[PDB]
Copies of this chain bind each other. A is one copy, B any other.
């Protein structure tokens, strides 16, 4: 069914865990089959598990950790802050992001928007 707020906090937290270990198969299975991802928010969205797989394939040594609790609503949505560590121009950099997700009635991510820009990038 439409995930409760507690359920949303556990799913959002698990998607960051899966990113962190680079488990592309498990990541893409968290998404609805026709989910849309906008990352960064403002850019054209990508649609469908195929494209979202390709995204993570290309994007993912990269680490990612929640930097605070997940915030969850009563209508299936929530938002979380996290930090991605990865290489930029040959040095270790960090990028601060917040992801906003809405879930469908099967508990899968229907949409994700990832808020970040170069102002959030640090060497």
| A interface, over-half SS | mixed
Q: How far is the CB of A84 from chain B (nearest CB, A)?
A: 12
Distance, CA A77 to CA B42, complexed state (A): 8
Q: Evaluate contact between B117 and A74: CB separation under 8 angstroms.
A: yes
Kindly list chain B residues whose C-beta atoms are within 8 Å of the C-beta of A78. 115
Q: How many identical chains are in the complex?
A: 2
B119 touches A72 (CB 8 A): yes
A98 and B117 in contact, given A42-B74, A73-B40, A74-B42 (Cβ under 8 angstroms): no
Q: How far is the CA of A119 from the CA of B81 in the complex (A)?
A: 16
Task: Name the B residues within 8 Å of A81 (CB-CB).
Answer: 67-68, 71, 81, 98
Q: How far is the CB of A61 from chain B (nearest CB, A)?
A: 23
